[PDB]
PDB file of C-alpha atoms in Angstrom:
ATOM      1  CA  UNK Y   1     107.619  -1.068 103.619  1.00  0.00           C
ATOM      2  CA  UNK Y   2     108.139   0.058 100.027  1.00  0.00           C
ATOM      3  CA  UNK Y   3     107.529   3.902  99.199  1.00  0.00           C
ATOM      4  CA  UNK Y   4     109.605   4.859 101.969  1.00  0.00           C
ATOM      5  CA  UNK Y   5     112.409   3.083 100.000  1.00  0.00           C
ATOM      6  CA  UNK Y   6     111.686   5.168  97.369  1.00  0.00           C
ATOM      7  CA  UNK Y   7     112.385   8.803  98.820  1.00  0.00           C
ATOM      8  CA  UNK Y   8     115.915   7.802  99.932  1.00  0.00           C
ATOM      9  CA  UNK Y   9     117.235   9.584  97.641  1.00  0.00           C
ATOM     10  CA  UNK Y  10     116.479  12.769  95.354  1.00  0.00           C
ATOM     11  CA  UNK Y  11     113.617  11.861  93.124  1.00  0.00           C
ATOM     12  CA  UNK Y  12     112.729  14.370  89.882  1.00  0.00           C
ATOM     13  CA  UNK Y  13     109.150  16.216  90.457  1.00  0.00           C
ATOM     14  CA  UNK Y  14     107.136  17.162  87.550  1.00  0.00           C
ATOM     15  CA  UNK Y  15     104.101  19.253  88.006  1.00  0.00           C
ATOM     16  CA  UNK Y  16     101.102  19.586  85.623  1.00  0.00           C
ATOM     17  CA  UNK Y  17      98.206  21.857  86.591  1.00  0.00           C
ATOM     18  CA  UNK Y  18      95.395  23.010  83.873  1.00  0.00           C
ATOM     19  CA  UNK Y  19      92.753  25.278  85.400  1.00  0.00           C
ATOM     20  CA  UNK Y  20      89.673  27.317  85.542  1.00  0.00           C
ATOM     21  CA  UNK Y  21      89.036  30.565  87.433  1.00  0.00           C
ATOM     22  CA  UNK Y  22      86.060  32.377  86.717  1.00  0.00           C
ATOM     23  CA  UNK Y  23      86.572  31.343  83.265  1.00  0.00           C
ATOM     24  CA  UNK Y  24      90.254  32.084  82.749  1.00  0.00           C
ATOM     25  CA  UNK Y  25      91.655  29.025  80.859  1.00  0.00           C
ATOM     26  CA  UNK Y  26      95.387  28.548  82.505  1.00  0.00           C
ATOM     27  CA  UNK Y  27      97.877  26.028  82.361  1.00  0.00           C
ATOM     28  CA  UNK Y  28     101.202  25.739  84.685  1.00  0.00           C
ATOM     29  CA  UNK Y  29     103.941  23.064  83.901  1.00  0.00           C
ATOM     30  CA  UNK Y  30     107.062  23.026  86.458  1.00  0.00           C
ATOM     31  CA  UNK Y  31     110.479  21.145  87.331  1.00  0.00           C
ATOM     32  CA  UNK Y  32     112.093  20.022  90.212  1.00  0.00           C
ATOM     33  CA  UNK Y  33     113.225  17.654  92.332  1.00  0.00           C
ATOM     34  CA  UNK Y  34     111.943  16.378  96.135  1.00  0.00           C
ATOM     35  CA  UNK Y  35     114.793  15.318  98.885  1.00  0.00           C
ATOM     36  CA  UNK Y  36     112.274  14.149 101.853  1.00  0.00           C
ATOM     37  CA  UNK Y  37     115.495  13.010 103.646  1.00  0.00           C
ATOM     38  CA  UNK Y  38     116.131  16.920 104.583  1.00  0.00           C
ATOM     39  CA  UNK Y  39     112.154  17.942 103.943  1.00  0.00           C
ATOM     40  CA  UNK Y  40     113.487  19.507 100.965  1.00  0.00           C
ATOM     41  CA  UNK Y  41     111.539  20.108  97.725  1.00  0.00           C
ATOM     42  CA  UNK Y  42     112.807  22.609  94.446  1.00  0.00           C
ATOM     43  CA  UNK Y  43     110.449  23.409  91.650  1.00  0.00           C
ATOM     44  CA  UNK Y  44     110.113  26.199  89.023  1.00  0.00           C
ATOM     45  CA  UNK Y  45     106.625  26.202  88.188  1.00  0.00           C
ATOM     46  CA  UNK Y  46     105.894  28.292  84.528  1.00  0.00           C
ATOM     47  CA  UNK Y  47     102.458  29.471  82.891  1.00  0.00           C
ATOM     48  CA  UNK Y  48     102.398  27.690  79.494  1.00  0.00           C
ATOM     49  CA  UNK Y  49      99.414  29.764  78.431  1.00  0.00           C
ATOM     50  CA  UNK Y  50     100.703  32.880  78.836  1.00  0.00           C
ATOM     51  CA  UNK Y  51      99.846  35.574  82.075  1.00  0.00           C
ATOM     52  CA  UNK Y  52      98.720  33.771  84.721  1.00  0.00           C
ATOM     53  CA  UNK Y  53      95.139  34.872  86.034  1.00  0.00           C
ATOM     54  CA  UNK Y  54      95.914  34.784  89.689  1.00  0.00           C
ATOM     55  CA  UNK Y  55      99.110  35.693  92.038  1.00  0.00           C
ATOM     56  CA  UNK Y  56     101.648  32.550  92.081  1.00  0.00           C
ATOM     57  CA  UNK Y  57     101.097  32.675  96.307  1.00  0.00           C
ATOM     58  CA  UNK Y  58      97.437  31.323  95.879  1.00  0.00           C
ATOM     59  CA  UNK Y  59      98.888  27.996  93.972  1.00  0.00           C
ATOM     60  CA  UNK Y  60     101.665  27.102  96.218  1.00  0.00           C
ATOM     61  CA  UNK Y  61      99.598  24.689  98.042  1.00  0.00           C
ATOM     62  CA  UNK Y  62      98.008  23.458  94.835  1.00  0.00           C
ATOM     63  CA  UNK Y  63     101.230  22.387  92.517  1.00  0.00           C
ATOM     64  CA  UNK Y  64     103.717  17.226  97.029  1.00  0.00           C
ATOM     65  CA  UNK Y  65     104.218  16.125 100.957  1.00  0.00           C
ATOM     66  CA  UNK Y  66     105.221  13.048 100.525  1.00  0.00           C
ATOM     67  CA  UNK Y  67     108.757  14.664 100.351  1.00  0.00           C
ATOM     68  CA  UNK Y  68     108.295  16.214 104.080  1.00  0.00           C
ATOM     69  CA  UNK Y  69     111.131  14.679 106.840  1.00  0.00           C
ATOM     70  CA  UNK Y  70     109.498  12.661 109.321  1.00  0.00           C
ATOM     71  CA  UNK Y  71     111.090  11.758 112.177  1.00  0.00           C
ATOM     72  CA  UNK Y  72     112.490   7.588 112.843  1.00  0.00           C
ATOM     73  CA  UNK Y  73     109.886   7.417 115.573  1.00  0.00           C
ATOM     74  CA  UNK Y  74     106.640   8.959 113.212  1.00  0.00           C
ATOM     75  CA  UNK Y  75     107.792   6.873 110.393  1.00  0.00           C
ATOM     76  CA  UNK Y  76     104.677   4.716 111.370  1.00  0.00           C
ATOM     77  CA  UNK Y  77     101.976   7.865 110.320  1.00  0.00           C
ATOM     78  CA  UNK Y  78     103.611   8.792 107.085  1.00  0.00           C
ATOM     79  CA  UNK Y  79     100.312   8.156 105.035  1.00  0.00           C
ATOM     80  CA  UNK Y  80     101.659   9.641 102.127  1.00  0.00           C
ATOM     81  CA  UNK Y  81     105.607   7.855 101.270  1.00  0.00           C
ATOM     82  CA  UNK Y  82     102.651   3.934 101.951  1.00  0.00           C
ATOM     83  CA  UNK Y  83     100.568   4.492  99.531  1.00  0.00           C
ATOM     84  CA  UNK Y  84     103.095   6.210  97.317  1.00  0.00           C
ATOM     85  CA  UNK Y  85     104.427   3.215  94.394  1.00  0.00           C
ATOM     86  CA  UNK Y  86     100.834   3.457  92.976  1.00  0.00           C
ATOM     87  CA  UNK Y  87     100.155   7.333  94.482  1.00  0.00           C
ATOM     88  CA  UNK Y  88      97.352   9.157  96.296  1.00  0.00           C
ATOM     89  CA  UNK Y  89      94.675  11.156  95.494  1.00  0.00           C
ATOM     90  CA  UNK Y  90      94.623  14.783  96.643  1.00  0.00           C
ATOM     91  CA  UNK Y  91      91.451  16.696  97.243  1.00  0.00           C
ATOM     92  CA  UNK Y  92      91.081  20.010  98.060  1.00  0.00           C
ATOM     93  CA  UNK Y  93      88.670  22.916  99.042  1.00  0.00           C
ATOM     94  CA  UNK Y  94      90.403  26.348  99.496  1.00  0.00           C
ATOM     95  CA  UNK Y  95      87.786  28.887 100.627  1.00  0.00           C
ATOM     96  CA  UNK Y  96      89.291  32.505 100.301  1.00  0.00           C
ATOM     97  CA  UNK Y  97      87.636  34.697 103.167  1.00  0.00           C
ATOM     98  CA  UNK Y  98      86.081  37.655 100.844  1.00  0.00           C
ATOM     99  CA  UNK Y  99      86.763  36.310  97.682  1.00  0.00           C
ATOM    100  CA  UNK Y 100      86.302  33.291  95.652  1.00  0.00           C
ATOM    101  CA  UNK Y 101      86.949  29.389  96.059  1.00  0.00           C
ATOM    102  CA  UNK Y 102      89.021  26.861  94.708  1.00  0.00           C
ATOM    103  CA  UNK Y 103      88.352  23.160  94.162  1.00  0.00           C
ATOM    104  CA  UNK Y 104      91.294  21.245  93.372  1.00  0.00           C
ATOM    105  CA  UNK Y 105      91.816  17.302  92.556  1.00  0.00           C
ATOM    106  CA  UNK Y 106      95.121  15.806  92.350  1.00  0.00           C
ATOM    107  CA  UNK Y 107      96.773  12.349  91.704  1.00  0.00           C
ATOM    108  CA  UNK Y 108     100.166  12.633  92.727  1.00  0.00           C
ATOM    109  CA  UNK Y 109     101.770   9.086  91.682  1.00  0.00           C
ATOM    110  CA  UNK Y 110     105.406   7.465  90.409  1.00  0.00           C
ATOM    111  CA  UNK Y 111     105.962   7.773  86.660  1.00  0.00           C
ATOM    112  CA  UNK Y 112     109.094   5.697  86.790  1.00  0.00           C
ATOM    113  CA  UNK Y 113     111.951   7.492  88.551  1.00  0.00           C
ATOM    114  CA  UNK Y 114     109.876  10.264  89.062  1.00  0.00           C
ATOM    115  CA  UNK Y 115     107.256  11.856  90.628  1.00  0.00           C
ATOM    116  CA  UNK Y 116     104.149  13.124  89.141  1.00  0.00           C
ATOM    117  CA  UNK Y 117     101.522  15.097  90.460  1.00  0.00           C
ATOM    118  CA  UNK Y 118      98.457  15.971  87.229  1.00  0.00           C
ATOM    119  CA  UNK Y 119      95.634  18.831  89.070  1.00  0.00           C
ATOM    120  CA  UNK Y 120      92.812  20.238  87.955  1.00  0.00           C
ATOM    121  CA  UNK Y 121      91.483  23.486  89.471  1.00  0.00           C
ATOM    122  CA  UNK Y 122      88.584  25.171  89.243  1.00  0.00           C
ATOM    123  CA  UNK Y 123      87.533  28.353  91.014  1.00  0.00           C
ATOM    124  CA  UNK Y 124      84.686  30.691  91.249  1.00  0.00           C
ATOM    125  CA  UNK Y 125      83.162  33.470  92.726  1.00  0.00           C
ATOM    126  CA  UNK Y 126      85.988  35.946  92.707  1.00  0.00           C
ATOM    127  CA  UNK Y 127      85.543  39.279  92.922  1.00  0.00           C
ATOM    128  CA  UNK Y 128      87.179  40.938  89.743  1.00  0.00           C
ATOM    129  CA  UNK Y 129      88.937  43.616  92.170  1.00  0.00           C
ATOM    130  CA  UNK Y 130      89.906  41.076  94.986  1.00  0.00           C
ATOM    131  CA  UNK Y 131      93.015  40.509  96.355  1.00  0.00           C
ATOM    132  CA  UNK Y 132      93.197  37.730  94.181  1.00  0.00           C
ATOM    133  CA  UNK Y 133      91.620  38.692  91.032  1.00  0.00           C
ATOM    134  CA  UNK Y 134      93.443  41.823  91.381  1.00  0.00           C
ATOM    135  CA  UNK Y 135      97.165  40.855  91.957  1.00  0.00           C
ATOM    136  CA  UNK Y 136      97.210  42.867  95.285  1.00  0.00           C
ATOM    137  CA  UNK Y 137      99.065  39.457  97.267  1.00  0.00           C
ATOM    138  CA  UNK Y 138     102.397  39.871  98.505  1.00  0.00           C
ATOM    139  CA  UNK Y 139     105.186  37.870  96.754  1.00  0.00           C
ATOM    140  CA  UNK Y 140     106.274  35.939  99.493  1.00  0.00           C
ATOM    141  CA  UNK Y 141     104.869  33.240 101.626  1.00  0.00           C
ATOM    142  CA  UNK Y 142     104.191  32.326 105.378  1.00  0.00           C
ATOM    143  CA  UNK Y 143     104.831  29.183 107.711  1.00  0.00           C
ATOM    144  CA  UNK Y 144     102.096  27.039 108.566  1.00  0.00           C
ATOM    145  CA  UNK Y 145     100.648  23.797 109.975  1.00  0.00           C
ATOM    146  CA  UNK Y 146      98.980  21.443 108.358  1.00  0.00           C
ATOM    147  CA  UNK Y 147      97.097  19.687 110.642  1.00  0.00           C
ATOM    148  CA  UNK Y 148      96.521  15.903 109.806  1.00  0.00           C
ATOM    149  CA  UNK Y 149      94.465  12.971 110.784  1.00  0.00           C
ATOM    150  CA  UNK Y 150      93.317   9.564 109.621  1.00  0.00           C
ATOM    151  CA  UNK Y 151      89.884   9.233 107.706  1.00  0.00           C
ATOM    152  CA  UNK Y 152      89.298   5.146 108.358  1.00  0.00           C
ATOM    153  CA  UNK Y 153      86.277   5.477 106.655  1.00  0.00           C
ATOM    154  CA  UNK Y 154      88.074   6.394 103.034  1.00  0.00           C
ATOM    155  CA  UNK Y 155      91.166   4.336 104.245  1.00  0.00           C
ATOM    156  CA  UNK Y 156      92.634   7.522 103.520  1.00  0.00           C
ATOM    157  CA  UNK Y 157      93.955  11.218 105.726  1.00  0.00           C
ATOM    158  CA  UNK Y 158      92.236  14.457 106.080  1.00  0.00           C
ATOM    159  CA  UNK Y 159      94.360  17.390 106.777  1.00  0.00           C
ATOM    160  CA  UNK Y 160      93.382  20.697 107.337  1.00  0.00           C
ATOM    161  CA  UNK Y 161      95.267  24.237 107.824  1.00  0.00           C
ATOM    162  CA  UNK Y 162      95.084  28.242 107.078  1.00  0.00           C
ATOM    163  CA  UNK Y 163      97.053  30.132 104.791  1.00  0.00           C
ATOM    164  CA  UNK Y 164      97.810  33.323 105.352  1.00  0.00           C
ATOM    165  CA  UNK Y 165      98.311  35.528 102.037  1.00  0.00           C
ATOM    166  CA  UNK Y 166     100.222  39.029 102.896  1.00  0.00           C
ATOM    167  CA  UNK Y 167      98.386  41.524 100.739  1.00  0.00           C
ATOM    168  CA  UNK Y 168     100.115  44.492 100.011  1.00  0.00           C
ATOM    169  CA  UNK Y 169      98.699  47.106 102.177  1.00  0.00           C
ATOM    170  CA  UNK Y 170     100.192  45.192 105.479  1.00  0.00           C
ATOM    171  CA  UNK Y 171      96.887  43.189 105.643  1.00  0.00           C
ATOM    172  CA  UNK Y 172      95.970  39.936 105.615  1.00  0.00           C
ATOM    173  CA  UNK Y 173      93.767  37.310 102.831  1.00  0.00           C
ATOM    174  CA  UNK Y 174      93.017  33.847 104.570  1.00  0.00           C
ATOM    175  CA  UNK Y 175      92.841  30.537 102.175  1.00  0.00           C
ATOM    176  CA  UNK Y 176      90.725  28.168 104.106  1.00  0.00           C
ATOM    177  CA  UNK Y 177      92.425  24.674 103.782  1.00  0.00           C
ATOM    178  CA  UNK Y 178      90.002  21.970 103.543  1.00  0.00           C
ATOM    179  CA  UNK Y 179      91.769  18.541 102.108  1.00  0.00           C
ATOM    180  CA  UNK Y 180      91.315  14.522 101.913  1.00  0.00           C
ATOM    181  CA  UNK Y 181      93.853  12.412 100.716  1.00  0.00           C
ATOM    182  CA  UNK Y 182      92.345   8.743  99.396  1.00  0.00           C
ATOM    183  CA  UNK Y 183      95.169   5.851  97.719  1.00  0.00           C
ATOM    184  CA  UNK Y 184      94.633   5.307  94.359  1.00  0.00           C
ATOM    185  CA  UNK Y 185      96.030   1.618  94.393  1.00  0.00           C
ATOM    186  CA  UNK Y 186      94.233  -1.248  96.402  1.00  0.00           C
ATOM    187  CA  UNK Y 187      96.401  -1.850  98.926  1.00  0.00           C
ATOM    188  CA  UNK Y 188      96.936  -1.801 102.462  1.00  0.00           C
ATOM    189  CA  UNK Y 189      98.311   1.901 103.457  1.00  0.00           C
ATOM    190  CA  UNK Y 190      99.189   3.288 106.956  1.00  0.00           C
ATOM    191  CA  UNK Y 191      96.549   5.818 108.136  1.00  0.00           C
ATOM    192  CA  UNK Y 192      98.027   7.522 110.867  1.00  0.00           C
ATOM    193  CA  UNK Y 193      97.506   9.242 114.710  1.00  0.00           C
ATOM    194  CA  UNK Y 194      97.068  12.830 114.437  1.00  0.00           C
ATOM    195  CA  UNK Y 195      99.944  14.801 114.130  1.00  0.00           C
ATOM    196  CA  UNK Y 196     101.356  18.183 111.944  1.00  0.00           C
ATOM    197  CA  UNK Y 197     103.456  19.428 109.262  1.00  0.00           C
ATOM    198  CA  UNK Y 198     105.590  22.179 110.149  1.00  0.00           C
ATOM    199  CA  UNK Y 199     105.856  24.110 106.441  1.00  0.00           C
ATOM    200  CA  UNK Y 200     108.129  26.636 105.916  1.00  0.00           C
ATOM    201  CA  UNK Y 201     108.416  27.845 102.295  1.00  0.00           C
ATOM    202  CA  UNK Y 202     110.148  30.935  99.800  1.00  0.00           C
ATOM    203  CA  UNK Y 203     108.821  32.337  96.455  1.00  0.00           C
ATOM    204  CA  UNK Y 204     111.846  33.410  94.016  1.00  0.00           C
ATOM    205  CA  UNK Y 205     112.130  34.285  90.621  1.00  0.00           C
ATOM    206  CA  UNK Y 206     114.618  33.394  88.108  1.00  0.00           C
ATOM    207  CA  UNK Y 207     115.625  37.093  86.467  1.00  0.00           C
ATOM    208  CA  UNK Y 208     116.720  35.307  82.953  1.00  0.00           C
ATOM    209  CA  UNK Y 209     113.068  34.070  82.069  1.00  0.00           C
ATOM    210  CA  UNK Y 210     110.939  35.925  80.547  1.00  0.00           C
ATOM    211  CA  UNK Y 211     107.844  33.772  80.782  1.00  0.00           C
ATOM    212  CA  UNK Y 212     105.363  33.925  84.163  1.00  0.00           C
ATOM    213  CA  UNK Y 213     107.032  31.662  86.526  1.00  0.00           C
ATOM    214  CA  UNK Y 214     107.567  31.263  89.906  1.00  0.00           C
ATOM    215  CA  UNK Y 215     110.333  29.223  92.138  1.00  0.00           C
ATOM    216  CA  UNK Y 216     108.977  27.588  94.882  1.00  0.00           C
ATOM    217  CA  UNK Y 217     111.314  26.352  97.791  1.00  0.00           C
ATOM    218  CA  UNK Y 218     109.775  23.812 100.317  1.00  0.00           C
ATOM    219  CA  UNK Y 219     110.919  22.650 103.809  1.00  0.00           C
ATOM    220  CA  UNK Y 220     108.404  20.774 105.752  1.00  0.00           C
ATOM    221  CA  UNK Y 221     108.574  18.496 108.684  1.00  0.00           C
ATOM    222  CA  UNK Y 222     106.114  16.382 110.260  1.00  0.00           C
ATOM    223  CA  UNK Y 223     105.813  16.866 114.207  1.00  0.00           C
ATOM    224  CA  UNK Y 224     103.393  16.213 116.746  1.00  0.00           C
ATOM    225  CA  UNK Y 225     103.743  12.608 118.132  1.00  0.00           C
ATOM    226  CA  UNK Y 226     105.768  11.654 121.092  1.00  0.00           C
ATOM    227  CA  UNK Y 227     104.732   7.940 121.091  1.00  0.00           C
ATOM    228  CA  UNK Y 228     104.506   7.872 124.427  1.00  0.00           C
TER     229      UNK Y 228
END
């Protein structure tokens, strides 16, 4: 169908996040493009507003999977590229283990030739000398799976996964991924048999900027279907 003719190619990504944790006021704007054909996606993701409250690890998931490689055979449970033309909505709950949550919603839709994907985030409860709220995360980040399957009642997906956060004394803060994805247009999507993503992903910085930024590499593949 359409939307998987879309991500043929290399399509630009712009990201647009304004939040809210525990009263910090932040907004991150970022560039890139997505390559789904290879898993690939490229951003640079900035801080408009200045020092950004949290470490850049903790919005990776936040500021994209319809750009993830699935396989010829799994092309059939790609949720994400069907409902794509009009977009999808992307809820989350992140629960951090001794710390605070986040509650994101996203609409991740086409703006013309490109990609757009608007959040707003709001956390709470964080301790003001957490890992989080004190900037004691690693600057790197792990591989994961995201574990999806349908939700026929929303005509939408539900995925869910755990992130594990390096923190700089060699232990480790978990983010609790809780998420439902619901199509913003009124159409007729594929919701698909439970399967994975496969996410491997690298934090970089750019050493001739000056503002709070982080580069965020993506490869992702979906897995977890033999048809039969």
């Amino acid at each position: 169908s359409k939307g998987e003719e879309l991500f043929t190619g290399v399509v630009p990504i712009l990201v647009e996040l304004d939040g809210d944790v525990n009263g910090h006021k932040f907004s991150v704007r970022g560039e890139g493009e997505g390559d789904a054909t290879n898993g690939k996606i490229t951003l640079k993701l900035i801080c408009t507003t200045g020092k950004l409250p949290v470490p850049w690890p903790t919005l990776v998931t936040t500021c994209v999977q319809c750009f993830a490689r699935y396989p010829d055979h799994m092309k059939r449970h790609d949720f994400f590229k069907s409902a794509m033309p009009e977009g999808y909505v992307q809820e989350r709950t992140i629960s951090f283990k001794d710390d605070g949550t986040f509650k994101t919603r996203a609409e991740v839709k086409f703006e013309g030739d490109t990609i757009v994907n608007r959040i707003k985030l709001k956390g709470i409860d964080f301790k003001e000398d957490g890992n989080i709220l004190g900037h004691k995360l690693e600057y790197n980040f792990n591989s994961h799976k995201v574990y999806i399957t349908a939700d026929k009642q929303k005509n939408g997906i539900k995925a869910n996964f755990k992130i594990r956060h390096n923190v700089e004394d060699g232990s480790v803060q978990l983010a609790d991924h809780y998420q439902q994805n619901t199509p913003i247009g009124d159409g007729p999507v594929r919701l698909p048999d439970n399967h994975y993503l496969s996410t491997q992903s690298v934090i970089l910085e750019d050493p001739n900027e000056k503002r709070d930024h982080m580069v965020l590499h993506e490869f992702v593949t979906a897995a977890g279907i033999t048809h039969g």
